[PDB]
Amino acid sequence: ASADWKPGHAMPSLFKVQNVNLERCELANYKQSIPMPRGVHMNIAKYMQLCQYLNTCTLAVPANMRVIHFGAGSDKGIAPGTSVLRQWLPTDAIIIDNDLNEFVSDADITLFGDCVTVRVGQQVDLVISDMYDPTTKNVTGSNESKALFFTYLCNLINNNLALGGSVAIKITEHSWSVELYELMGKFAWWTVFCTNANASSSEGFLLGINYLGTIKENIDGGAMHANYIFWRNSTPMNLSTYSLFDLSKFQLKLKGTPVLQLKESQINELVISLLSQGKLLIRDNDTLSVSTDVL
Amino acid sequence: NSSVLSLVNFTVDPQKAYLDFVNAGGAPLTNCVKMLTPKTGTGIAISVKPESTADQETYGGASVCLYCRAHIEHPDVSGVCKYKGKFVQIPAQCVRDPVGFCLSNTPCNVCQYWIGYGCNC
Numbered sequence A: 001a002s003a004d005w006k007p008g009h010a011m012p013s014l015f016k017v018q019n020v021n022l023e024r025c026e027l028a029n030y031k032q033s034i035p036m037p038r039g040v041h042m043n044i045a046k047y048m049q050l051c052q053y054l055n056t057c058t059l060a061v062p063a064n065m066r067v068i069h070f071g072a073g074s075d076k077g078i079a080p081g082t083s084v085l086r087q088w089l090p091t092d093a094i095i096i097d098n099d100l101n102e103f104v105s106d107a108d109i110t111l112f113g114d115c116v117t118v119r120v121g122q123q124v125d126l127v128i129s130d131m132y133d134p135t136t137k138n139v140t141g142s143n144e145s146k147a148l149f150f151t152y153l154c155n156l157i158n159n160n161l162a163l164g165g166s167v168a169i170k171i172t173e174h175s176w177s178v179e180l181y182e183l184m185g186k187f188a189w190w191t192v193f194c195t196n197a198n199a200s201s202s203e204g205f206l207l208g209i210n211y212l213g214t215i216k217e218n219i220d221g222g223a224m225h226a227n228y229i230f231w232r233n234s235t236p237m238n239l240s241t242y243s244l245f246d247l248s249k250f251q252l253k254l255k256g257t258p259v260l261q262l263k264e265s266q267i268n269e270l271v272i273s274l275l276s277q278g279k280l281l282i283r284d285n286d287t288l289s290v291s292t293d294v295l
Numbered sequence B: 001n002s003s004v005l006s007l008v009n010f011t012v013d014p015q016k017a018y019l020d021f022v023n024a025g026g027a028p029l030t031n032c033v034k035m036l037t038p039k040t041g042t043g044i045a046i047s048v049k050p051e052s053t054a055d056q057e058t059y060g061g062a063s064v065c066l067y068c069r070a071h072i073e074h075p076d077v078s079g080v081c082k083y084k085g086k087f088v089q090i091p092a093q094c095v096r097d098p099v100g101f102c103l104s105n106t107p108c109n110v111c112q113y114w115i116g117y118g119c120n121c
Ligand SMILES: C[n+]1cn([C@@H]2O[C@H](COP(=O)(O)OP(=O)(O)OP(=O)(O)OC[C@H]3O[C@@H](n4cnc5c(=O)[nH]c(N)nc54)[C@H](O)[C@@H]3O)[C@@H](O)[C@H]2O)c2nc(N)[nH]c(=O)c21
Pocket: A025, A026, A027, A028, A030, A131, A132, A133, A134, A136, A137, A139, A172, A173, A174, A175, A200, A201, A202, A203
């Protein structure tokens, strides 16, 4: 099927507008595994498909692009996702990655420890999170909004994300946050994206495209997660990596997006329109300083 | 992995200890980060983006560096790893042990291709 050649599935407005109770997620192919092309790690394909989808989005892509990647490490002590980001992003992009446990990576800066220890001195352009807390597997009682690392990420979106910047944050059926869904309403556009390489998981990447710093859509976060699960329960997704068969255009377009400093007073309709089309970032243009704090 | 990695911490010559280990039948270090690429690159050894030809595979550089993978001191006089943050092209006939391939070989300082596997100087 055509969808098997796409990098994955994006939550459609058909399901965003629903009004339903939160139900258990029941995927027909749950936990099936796709053999991997060339035997690369599964996360190579997953991250490549997320990048391919973001290639269709209005991402801001400036010189010296500031990218932070949380949950970058593995039990194997390596970071396949970070290498994919290095392959995808402009060569002058700055990649900072982080994980609770020690690992080695191709990032420019690597920080170990809880993401709460990561001090972002200046605003960034793109946040990727693959964090997941193992205690989420200990499902007891009802599936309520989680705190965990989501408190940190929500504060980061409100304070340390450039206007025009974007986020891709991994959620699952039980690993999710009301507050993060509501913050998607402060972007020009948003969705949940599910890779074909991991279609048999309730994993999705909650995507916020072009941060506006103001409410564009009023979202009820609890109801929206219920809509996400309703979508997953209604939508056949077959495991596939066919989208990776042709990689001639995989690299992120070198858009040259300008970075401007503006006071809030000066943000008019022209500026908002440029932000919403991926044509402008607003933040400092100093040197980025990201370090480990002592808490 | 946990063994050969443990091993190169009990010696003053990690490169020799790794190579002797795999030359004597020991299992190469696994979990090197092999990328998926259009095999349409220039074929040079170390590159800012993947450059595999049809006869090569590309790996993330940190993952094929013994010193990175074992978290030990790099030997370069600059202190800067030659691989980390870049991509490393490995001949397809050598993918059984990318770490050992890198320990065993040097890119041409003039043409940047692997001596013996691409350099035509
Ligand atoms: C969707 N679904 C959930 N359950 C049930 O509800 C529980 C919580 O789900 P959950 O929110 O983990 O989501 P899953 O998709 O398992 O995530 P899955 O793909 O595992 O997780 C994605 C991420 O999990 C992460 N993960 C698992 N172990 C660890 C760990 O030890 N440490 C860390 N950091 N991450 C882990 C890993 O990062 C992976 O990429 C599940 O365990 C099932 O009991 C389902 N049961 C049935 N029968 N059918 C289903 O369709 C179904």
